[PDB]
Ligand binder design. Structure first.
Ligand SMILES: [Cu+2]
Ligand SMILES: [Cu+2]
Ligand SMILES: [Cu+2]
Ligand SMILES: [Cu+2]
Lengths: 128, 128, 128, 128
């Protein structure tokens, strides 16, 4: 809805989009994430994490180390621009963020930090 | 909102959905396929092919063996319940099939037959 | 090695190999599975499963529906030609099966049935 | 990579190896990429491209917007430490890099930039 988008993480380990362009005019941007399917959080949990394309591997990696308990994300990870919780099947979480925290000319990526998921579960937040 | 789905196949080789539910009640079923992106058909084509889950492997094998001149589908392959055209980026196609050609208690699956694709571009279809 | 093969399923969802060649003169064939890395089975579980290339999807679809508790393998699944248990990191398992269960010019796929992994974890098995 | 390392990208979109060990003593490294299979560059093209785990994504995203006519590689990408060209089956390319261009305690990776192959096709490389 102009300054929001709905993302679904599934039992097949996929997002439903790999591109999001956030609009200039928008003051804050929300991400509504849902997890259709039947698998719990501990085998197939998906979060939505945003960062510059250069900080991605560092966040996935520190996330990988942090554990299920840390939502598979390093607490107060300064490279994490915005993010939801790690939810299992049928659950939902949303994150709304300040747009002036993004700048034009920079490539961002969203990705899930559950182990190995970023493999297939990521996009460019097409602002790049 | 009921007996037709809109799906899309992208440039990162993913369908926007990996699972279609067909309410038995609907009598004809329609699928509108669009190719978001910029990659031409010879590079990243997307079709939407439906067979039983048992015939999928073979549709694919033979689909490959049929080159682009045949849209990566074997001519009048009896295994194909329905299918669209292989569409390059920025185009679309639609296909309507009779839902009576589906029997409860059987795994159906949609996949793209463009070489290499079936691995990510696929999902279930089920009468419900 | 002699009519037995060494393979891994690591933490990045990968097999080292994507093709096993079996000899018509090997009476039985043994596949030794080890999972290097630090992830526990619930997150990065790996089994090595064998079936024909046509039964792969149903074998995968059904095994996912089986649950961790059943190792993501539909028990008594007559479509499986051989399999290990699903192991976490630093665990091991091996399977030895009679080579007469294979027929010349039939195609064998080996894959992992852990939710999400088979698109990444699969390869070819062929009788020489 | 390695005195030389011989790698294969096939039509199943796979590299016959997910890990390189470049001997700190060997002064220039060679990687020989070949392509078993019968698929053309336009459909199943392969390049081996090396960078840091860190830059992996921006090169990937930037390689994709460059086209195969460019071999899906952004020219003068300072980040690519070395790369082959994109090749079709029945081809072999090679590349030799200066090994002082890598350091110890720096995460490196290889991947092919053909659209949607980076998720499958990738492995770490590490100075021994
Ligand atoms: Cu996930
Ligand atoms: Cu396709
Ligand atoms: Cu696995
Ligand atoms: Cu490739």
């Amino acid at each position: 809805a102009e300054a929001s988008v709905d993302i679904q993480g599934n039992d097949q380990m996929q997002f439903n989009t790999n591109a999001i362009t956030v609009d200039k005019s928008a003051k804050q941007f929300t991400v509504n994430l849902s997890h259709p399917g039947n698998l719990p959080k501990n085998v197939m949990g998906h979060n939505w994490v945003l960062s510059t394309a250069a900080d991605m591997q560092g966040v996935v990696t520190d996330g990988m180390a942090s554990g299920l308990d840390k939502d598979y994300l390093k607490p107060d990870d300064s490279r994490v621009i915005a993010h939801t919780k790690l939810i299992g099947s049928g659950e939902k979480d949303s994150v709304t963020f300040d747009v002036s925290k993004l700048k034009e000319g920079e490539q961002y990526m969203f990705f899930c930090t559950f182990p190995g998921h970023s493999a297939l579960m990521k996009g460019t937040l097409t602002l790049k």
